[PDB]
Design a protein around this nucleic acid. Structure first.
Ligand code: MG
Ligand code: ZN
Lengths: 226, 76, 198, 243, 190, 749, 123
DNA sequence: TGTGCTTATCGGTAGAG
DNA sequence: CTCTACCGATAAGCACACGTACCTCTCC
């Protein structure tokens, strides 16, 4: 958002409204925006007989370049729509003539303040204990498989342990030592007492898979070290 | 201790991360600091001055290992 | 029968080249013989019977190899048992038979049954028309002995199964007669590598 | 009325394995030359003058000869008297759900109802065979679905009545099943459920699941849509769509 | 007799002569070559073993450089290390066709990783399970995360296998480290 | 209650028998009309859990409850194994039936239910009553057990990929990004409204400030350089983030509404290793090809081209001292003492301005553009490109090979100084660049040259179309009677080109090389001050093929799909109303069924297109906007990463796999000088370099005979299918002794 | 039509072969075929313009409207025979094609801050 | 919407009395 | 001379994916 005193101004004092890059034109291949600008400029500048003026822009019956350049030359401007401007920051003249003209632009419904999805600590999922995917709430950003796969190649396993276990859904699981079943504080029904029960730190997805494998009829034996 | 003779960047980023967590938990620095409060700036100077009591247990794929030292290794 | 003789000359030349590459002391008169030295010098009505020979290794004359040419295709239990008895009565260990068509399934079990002493490698006549080792794609395959395999396993401190693997169905493992558990040295055109026959 | 040109699967002795002309009418596959002789035609000459080919091919004449042979083998003396109509009646009557009308009258209201005479629908059958033979001989292009010449659109005069009918067929079945229980030991505004059409139309307008044109279940989605009210151009192009 | 050939053999579709500049299987020290397309043999005979019976014209074709273009047929005729070079020559021509420049050391790792078991395995779940079945290293959780969890967990439970948690997903799913940049050393010893 | 902390090592997969099914369930229920949501239910309508103490669905684990049946039944996972002992009490072969299969898990007399936290219940609350029908109790058990989320009908792989593989995390943000060239390359512009609400963990919680590193990402992660750790710079803007436009090439995005989400690390152990391995100071070398990752953009590239190729726009002292305020190094000698008898001030050339970015100990030499740099002074340059762009011998790669410690501020100073110089000059696109002529007579001569060049290219294609096996009697040097009747067929050749696939494939290549002389007319008629020619010779955006379609003619318009209509070779009003035209359908030359569209547009994008020409352009450009077949670079990258993400480099010097320390390679390739790769995951960065080429590939086929470059990579990578299509293409060669005769190779082939 | 009398039919206009959102785009045959497909389909439905002349009988979830809507300076035949001013949703601004300190790179836009607070593009 | 994996069915072949 | 067991084509039956992020409206 540049101020009015910093824009390259025309000799009539007309500052531009929206400045676009010249590099977008050879790649996108859009001629006719400059033709619409040169037509709407020649319409709006006064002639120093306004009848029989080229006002039509019917697509499959467009006028030629010689009909637009002559209309822009009769108004008292250059033929190619470019005008000599001066630098608003220093006053010096520019070596090239800058193309100017009124062009019908549009404002889309995609604004930047409707896309902000910041989150520090918010609500969790009732099933998987993951953060929600609602921008009206605090939300959260899905650390997908590709963001893990490109962090594996960088050798960063400290953020990979934080963004998958610490900052994600973390839980706690108790494992019997002499027995090899999941002990639910902790008490092993197979063992005589809860004298040898160790606790490992696993994410909630591991327990959600364990309680599902036990639901489908598959038990698991957990061999721990410490 | 006959594997590479050079400290890798992956072990260096863990040694500095351990030393910063140690200094952030109010530990006495082995190097003399002169006007500094960031723990990473003390950790990089301790790594460049070879005055840190850490040992690297470089594991081997066969099952054994080679216990190294920080002062034995060199940093470029 | 001229086309059959022109095929059989290439079969014999590829067989002699394979036995020379394996190291079984093939003479120079059998390696550089032309078509004229194969027809006029040898017999004319052979009927796949005059090609049966016995070759011994260059380092030791105790390890022999008998090349068997069958008289007809689709060989069965009787002729394979006769070849097995002929190999057992002459106290040889390894045999090579060059059959024409595919074997019967009842004769394919007698090779796996009597496999402690006799090791009969089956070769097709279509596979021995073009030499496999004499190609620009195939690199140099050097067979390592046990004394080299021990110091190779002691150099990298690896196991016998922690290696790249080849199979016995591959034509390179059949060109040298490689059993399971051997290590082959491969030099690429240096950067060398090692495989393990599974 | 589907007339195909394929190989002779029926009565194949592993030698006569050329193409043949069969039809698919009322779920009964009969040869086309029996259907020619069942309607007015009494000879093979006037049956070939109806199928005006005017060409020179070997896949057309051999197929016509195979059709004549499979018509003469499946029915004995079919070219004399009225023996073809008995085979036509027995083929329709052997179906899973045959019509209760007589087969002499099923050829007047099911086989080409836009034509009046029984001999004219044989000439139309010969014209339909002639178009198929001209398309097989390469002198005629097949109909493509991408062209708008062979396509008709339906906005509300066929999309709405085909959903009205599938609810009226349920309202006429929920009426007899409630009047049968009150007939053997009442006004007319008691058995006719007036809400079964409204609750079906509101559900079809809300969920978007419209009735399939060639099925009963598997309701398609993408018939109705919501309007956009951001600018008058979006609601103008939303009323100007064709899917 | 109208579908019987009077020239050539029955199982060859079309043969065209092409000019090349960087050909596969190069010579010792631009050339013309032929590209033979053969029909699919319904029997047990291979297409190469039927192309070899080229019995009237055997010396005009350089048999020290000819090879099938398919990799699965190249490893069945000339070995795995000879089809590996064709795989590298095809990968270096398929990467450069997309307008990208890559190093050869990245392709020589994929070529030696897809040919550990003696043949080029498939990229699907069967080709990944065969590399573990040949090398005798069970990994049920990674194969479950690849294509199907239930169909792999049922076969893992019915056989009584044990997962040693050697991969990266097996470590990152139970709160561990993979062990490449962080996990293959220990500075806890003082 | 304080239990010790251990580490999980190995997990065993076994089928549960009836012995642990009752030992793992706590307070099992047996009544039919009893849900028993008091000992195993977290969302139950009670005050606390009876098993747990004070439960609030956070410190309570879901308990199980068994439903003991009356009689035993065969386990439903063993019905496919008991049909092997029988042909349709086998104590003779009993030893093989309990060693590998589990015999204790064969009898099923109980079945547990899921806790209320994981819910489903309408079937398990119906088979709890013990009744008869022994043969149909398993028919309810196998349907109650098939309601798991591991099976399918969040089910199957969708459960795994989004619970265990893909997880969400806290301390994240996502905002739309814009451009700010005033920032450093290792700095990201975080607004003061979002950074004030973003809390970090410091030894208590404090707000985000300057200097803190944050890991940024642009979805999707196309390769490993899409994750850059940048430092937070607090800006007075709001609801938007900003970085340099130079760093859009690692992110592979543009300022287009394209969002860019970041991840804020909390611990100091993740913060120390973030700016030591992941930041932009460490990702200087592009891992795919060994070159530099960052390069010049479009404005900087155009302003660096224009400051070097002009050599006649001299700067004075007051402009040079203004431009030196953004340059890191000092001022050179002026080198122009007097350029005129009325010159009262020393002037400065353009190549001395670009030479203020180089260090004094920097040497550079490019022989293709005559670029000679000696002692930090650009001495010579003459009409060349690709030494400022991305290449093997560019000056940014040599500057990275020189010091690699102070290049990130050299690129920033170049982007500032060239943007100041291009603002002092001014770059614009007017109608004179589109007209490509000076006056009306030059434009008329240009159109008369285009109208003859297209007519000559049509004759070139008509000549090349005769190279088939049907005109061999005509191509030979003999006496032909139809030699004057075969050349005049101007419409029959266009009809025969579109009906077959090989004649169009040999004519597209015959038009594309004859069009290289038609495209060479933009340099004769166009001026040196043309903006499109400047942006095409600089290599910033566009080429000459875009300028030819802008000014002179569109050219060849063809599609690689077989349609049911052709093009009438004129694209006029009379060609559309022709009944015997290939546009309608079967022209009758016996009917037609399919066409390969081939049409040349004589008009351009400046003079306006005909409605038939616009229809032709729409048909030929519809294939470029489909958004289909996009699952290939996703699933190919996924199946390539599952095969390669576990390969690393060992400390002994070998390339090992992670599954059992199995050997893959013995040593690494000798193409790189850096041999200190002993802790990097080589397989992951080897699969990322292939997936980045897989996403940035053309997903459209060139013709009907060839295929797309994406499908050609997919067929090469997925080549171990060991079956398919029965093609088996071979490639035979020729012998060396065939060259002893005159044209011996052609006769032999 | 004037010189050859061999047609026996004629069209009203060549621009009436397009939709209502495509026949109002000026110089539509001059642009690329992929770029007019964006404007006639996606950019025409998202452009904030006129909403309603009666916002009291409308209680729709979301409604947006500019303060000063403007018709364009050109005159297409569709907007001349349709007599609908709501076919164009936006405002015409003085657009210059120039570089502005590298702040318009990668398809960015530099706009006048002083003109936006005078009533331009305010909704 | 079709591609891939596993299993039942069927003809041709070979050893034995 | 016949009787009986094992293998390579030929259909038949069943699980397989549809990108990665996010972003609302409308009904269940
Ligand atoms: Mg964009
Ligand atoms: Zn509880």
């Amino acid at each position: 958002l540049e101020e009015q005193q910093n824009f390259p101004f025309t000799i009539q004092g007309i500052v531009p409204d929206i400045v676009i890059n010249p590099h977008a034109f050879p790649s996108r291949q859009t001629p006719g925006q400059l033709l619409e600008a040169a037509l709407s400029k020649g319409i709006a500048c006064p002639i120093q007989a306004y009848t029989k003026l080229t006002r039509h822009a019917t697509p499959f019956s467009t006028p030629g370049v010689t009909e637009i350049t002559e209309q822009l030359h009769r108004a008292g401007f250059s033929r190619w729509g470019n005008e000599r401007v001066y630098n608003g920051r220093s006053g010096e003249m520019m070596r090239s003539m800058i193309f100017m003209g009124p062009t019908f632009y549009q404002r889309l419904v995609h604004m930047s303040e409707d896309k902000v999805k910041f989150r520090n600590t918010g609500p969790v999922h009732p099933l998987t204990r993951q953060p929600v995917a609602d921008r009206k709430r605090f939300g959260g950003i899905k650390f997908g498989e590709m963001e893990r796969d490109c962090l594996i190649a960088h050798g960063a396993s400290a953020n990979l342990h934080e963004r998958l276990f610490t900052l994600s859904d973390s839980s706690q699981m108790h494992i019997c030592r002499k027995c090899k079943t999941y002990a639910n504080g902790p008490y092993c029904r197979v063992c005589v007492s809860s004298d040898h029960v160790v606790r490992v730190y696993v994410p909630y997805g591991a327990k959600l898979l364990c309680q599902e494998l036990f639901s489908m009829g598959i038990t698991l034996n957990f061999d721990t070290k410490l | 201790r006959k594997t590479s003779k050079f400290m890798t960047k992956y072990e260096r980023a863990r040694i500095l991360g351990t030393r910063a967590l140690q200094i952030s938990m109010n530990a006495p620095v082995m190097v003399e600091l002169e006007g500094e409060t960031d723990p990473l700036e003390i950790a990089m100077k301790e790594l460049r001055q070879r005055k840190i009591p850490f040992t690297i247990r470089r594991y081997l794929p066969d099952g054994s290992f080679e216990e190294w030292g920080v002062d034995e290794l060199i940093v470029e | 029968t001229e086309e059959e003789l022109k095929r059989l000359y290439r079969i014999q030349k590829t067989l002699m080249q394979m036995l020379r590459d394996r190291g079984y002391f093939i003479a120079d008169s059998e390696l550089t013989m032309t078509k004229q030295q194969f027809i006029r010098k040898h017999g004319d009505n052979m009927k796949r019977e005059d090609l049966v020979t016995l070759k011994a290794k260059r380092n030791d004359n105790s390890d022999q190899l008998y090349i068997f040419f069958p008289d007809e295709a689709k060989v069965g239990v009787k002729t394979m048992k006769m070849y097995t008895n002929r190999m057992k009565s002459e106290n040889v260990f390894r045999a090579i038979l060059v059959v024409q068509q595919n074997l019967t399934p009842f004769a394919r079990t007698c090779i796996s049954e009597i496999s402690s002493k006799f090791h009969l490698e089956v070769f097709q006549e279509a596979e021995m028309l073009v030499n496999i080792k004499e190609h620009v794609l195939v690199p140099e395959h050097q067979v390592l002995t046990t004394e080299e395999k021990k110091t190779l396993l002691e150099r990298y401190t690896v196991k016998e199964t922690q290696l790249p693997r080849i199979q016995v169905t591959d034509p390179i493992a059949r060109y040298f007669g490689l059993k399971r558990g051997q290590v082959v040295k491969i030099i690429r055109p240096r950067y060398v590598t090692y495989r393990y026959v599974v | 009325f589907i007339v195909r040109l394929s190989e002779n699967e029926k009565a194949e002795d592993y030698k006569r394995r050329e193409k043949v002309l069969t039809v698919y009418f009322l779920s009964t596959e009969i040869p086309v030359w029996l259907l020619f002789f069942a309607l007015g035609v009494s000879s093979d000459k006037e049956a070939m003058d109806l199928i005006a080919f005017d060409g020179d091919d070997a896949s057309i004449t051999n197929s016509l000869i195979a059709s004549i042979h499979v018509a003469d083998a499946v029915c004995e003396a079919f070219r004399c008297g009225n023996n073809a109509l008995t085979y036509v009646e027995q083929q329709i009557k052997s179906t899973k759900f045959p019509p209760a009308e007589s087969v002499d009258e099923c050829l007047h209201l099911y086989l080409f109802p836009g034509l009046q005479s029984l001999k004219k629908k044989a000439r139309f059958l010969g014209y339909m065979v002639k178009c198929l033979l001209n398309s097989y001989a390469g002198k005629r292009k097949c109909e493509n679905r991408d062209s708008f010449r062979n396509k008709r659109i339906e906005l509300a005069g066929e999309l709405l009545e085909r959903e009205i009918r599938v609810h009226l067929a349920h309202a006429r079945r929920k009426m007899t099943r409630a009047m049968q229980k009150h007939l053997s030991g009442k006004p007319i505004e008691h058995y006719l459920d007036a809400s079964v059409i409204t609750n079906g139309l509101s559900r079809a307008f809300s969920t978007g699941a419209w009735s399939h044109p060639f099925r009963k279940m598997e309701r398609v989605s993408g018939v109705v849509a919501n309007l956009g009210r951001a600018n008058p151009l979006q609601t103008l192009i939303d009323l100007r769509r064709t899917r | 007799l109208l579908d019987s050939p009077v020239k050539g053999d029955q199982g060859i579709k079309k043969v065209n002569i092409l000019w090349t500049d960087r050909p596969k299987a190069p010579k010792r020290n631009g050339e013309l070559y032929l590209k033979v397309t053969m029909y699919g043999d319904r029997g047990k005979r291979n297409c190469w073993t039927a192309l070899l019976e080229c019995l009237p014209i055997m010396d005009m074709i350089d048999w020290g450089r000819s090879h099938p273009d398919n990799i699965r047929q190249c490893c069945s005729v000339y070995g795995i290390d000879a089809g590996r070079s064709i795989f590298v020559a095809n990968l270096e021509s398929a990467v450069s066709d997309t307008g990208k420049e890559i190093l050869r050391e990245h392709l020589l790792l994929v070529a030696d990783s897809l040919s550990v078991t003696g043949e080029f395995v498939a990229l699907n779940a069967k080709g990944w399970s065969k590399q573990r079945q040949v090398e005798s290293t069970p990994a049920p959780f990674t194969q479950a995360c690849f294509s199907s969890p239930s169909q792999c967990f049922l076969k893992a439970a019915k056989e009584g296998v044990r997962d040693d948690l050697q991969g990266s997903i097996d470590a990152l799913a139970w709160g561990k480290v993979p062990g490449f940049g962080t996990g293959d050393q220990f500075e806890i010893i003082i | 209650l304080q239990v010790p902390v251990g580490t999980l090592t190995s997990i065993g997969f076994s089928i549960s028998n009836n012995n642990d099914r009752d030992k793992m369930s706590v307070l099992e229920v047996e009544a039919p009309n009893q849900v028993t949501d008091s000992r195993l239910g977290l969302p139950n309508p009670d005050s606390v859990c009876r098993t747990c103490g004070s439960k609030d669905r956070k410190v309570c684990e879901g308990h199980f409850g068994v439903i003991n049946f009356a009689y035993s039944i065969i386990n439903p996972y063993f019905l496919k194994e008991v049909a092997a002992l029988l042909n349709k009490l086998g104590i003779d072969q009993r030893l093989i039936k309990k060693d590998i299969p589990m015999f204790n898990s064969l009898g099923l007399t109980s079945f547990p239910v899921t806790p209320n936290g994981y819910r489903r219940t309408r079937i398990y609350k119906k088979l709890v009553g013990f009744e008869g029908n022994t043969l149909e109790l398993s028919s309810r058990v196998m349907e109650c057990m098939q309601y798991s989320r591991l099976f399918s009908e969040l089910c199957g792989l969708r459960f795994m990929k989004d619970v265990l593989l893909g997880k969400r995390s806290d301390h994240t943000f996502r905002t739309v990004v814009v451009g700010d060239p005033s920032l450093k390359l290792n700095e990201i512009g975080i607004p003061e409204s979002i950074a004030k609400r973003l809390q970090v963990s410091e030894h208590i919680f404090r707000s985000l400030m300057d200097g803190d590193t944050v890991l940024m990402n642009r979805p999707p992660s196309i390769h490993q350089h899409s994750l850059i750790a940048m430092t937070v710079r607090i800006l007075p803007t709001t609801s938007v983030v900003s970085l340099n436009p130079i760093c859009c090439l690692p992110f592979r995005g543009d300022f287009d509404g394209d969002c860019l989400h970041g991840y804020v690390p909390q611990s100091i152990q993740a913060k120390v290793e973030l700016d030591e391995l992941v930041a932009l100071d460490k990702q200087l070398i592009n891992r795919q090809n060994g070159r530099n990752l960052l390069s010049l953009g479009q404005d900087s590239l155009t302003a660096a081209y224009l400051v070097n190729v002009e050599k006649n726009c001299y700067l004075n002292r007051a402009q040079m001292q203004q431009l030196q305020m953004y340059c890191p190094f000092q001022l050179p000698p002026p080198a122009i003492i007097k350029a005129s008898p009325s010159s009262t001030e020393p002037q400065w050339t353009g190549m001395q301005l670009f030479g203020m970015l180089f260090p004094p100990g920097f040497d550079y030499t490019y022989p293709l553009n005559n670029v000679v740099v000696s002692n930090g002074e650009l001495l010579s340059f003459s009409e060349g490109s690709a030494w400022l762009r991305d290449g093997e011998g560019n000056f940014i790669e040599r500057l990275l090979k020189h010091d690699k410690g102070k290049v990130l501020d050299i690129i920033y100073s170049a982007q500032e100084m060239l943007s100041q110089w291009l603002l002092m000059r001014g770059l614009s696109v007017s109608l004179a660049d589109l007209y490509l002529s000076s006056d009306l007579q030059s434009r008329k001569n240009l159109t008369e040259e285009i109208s003859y060049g297209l007519r000559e290219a049509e004759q070139v294609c008509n000549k090349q179309q005769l190279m088939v096996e049907s005109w061999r009697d005509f191509l030979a040097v003999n006496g032909e009677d139809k030699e004057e009747d075969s050349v005049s067929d101007l419409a029959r050749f266009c009809y025969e080109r579109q009906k077959s696939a090989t004649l169009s494939e040999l004519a597209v290549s015959a038009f594309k090389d004859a069009y290289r002389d038609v495209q060479a007319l933009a340099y004769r008629y166009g001026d040196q001050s043309n903006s499109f020619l400047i942006m095409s010779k600089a290599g910033s955006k566009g080429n000459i093929g875009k300028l030819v379609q802008h000014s002179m003619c569109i050219g060849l318009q063809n599609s690689a799909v077989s349609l049911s209509f052709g093009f009438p070779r004129e694209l006029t009003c009379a060609a559309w109303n022709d009944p015997n035209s290939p546009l309608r359908g079967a022209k009758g030359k016996t009917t037609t069924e399919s066409y390969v569209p081939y049409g040349v547009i004589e008009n351009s994008f400046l003079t306006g297109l005909n409605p038939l020409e616009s229809f032709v352009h729409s048909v030929t450009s519809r294939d470029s906007s489909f958004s289909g077949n996009a699952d290939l670079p996703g699933t190919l990258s996924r199946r390539l990463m599952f095969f390669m993400r576990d390969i690393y480099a060992a400390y002994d010097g070998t390339v090992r796999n992670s599954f059992g320390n199995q050997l893959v390679q013995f040593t690494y390739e000798t193409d790189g000088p850096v041999e200190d790769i002993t802790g990097e995951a080589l397989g992951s960065l080897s699969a990322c370099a292939l997936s980045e080429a897989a996403y940035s590939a053309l997903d459209q086929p060139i013709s009907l005979l060839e295929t797309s470059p994406l499908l050609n990579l997919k067929n090469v990578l997925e080549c171990g299918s060991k079956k398919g299509q029965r093609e088996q293409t071979m490639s035979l060669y020729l012998s060396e002794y065939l060259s002893k005769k005159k044209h011996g190779f052609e006769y032999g082939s | 039509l004037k010189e050859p009398k061999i047609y026996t039919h004629c069209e009203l206009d060549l621009s009436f072969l397009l939709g209502v959102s495509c026949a109002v785009v000026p110089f539509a045959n001059h642009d690329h075929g992929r770029r007019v497909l964006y404007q006639s389909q996606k950019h025409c439905q998202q452009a904030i313009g006129f909403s309603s002349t009666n916002p009291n009988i409308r209680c729709d979830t979301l409604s947006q409207q500019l303060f000063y809507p403007q018709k364009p300076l050109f005159k297409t035949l569709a907007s001349e025979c349709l007599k609908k001013e709501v076919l164009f949703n936006g405002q015409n601004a003085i657009v210059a094609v120039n570089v502005h300190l590298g702040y318009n790179q990668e398809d960015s836009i530099v706009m006048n801050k002083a003109s936006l607070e005078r009533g331009m593009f305010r909704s």
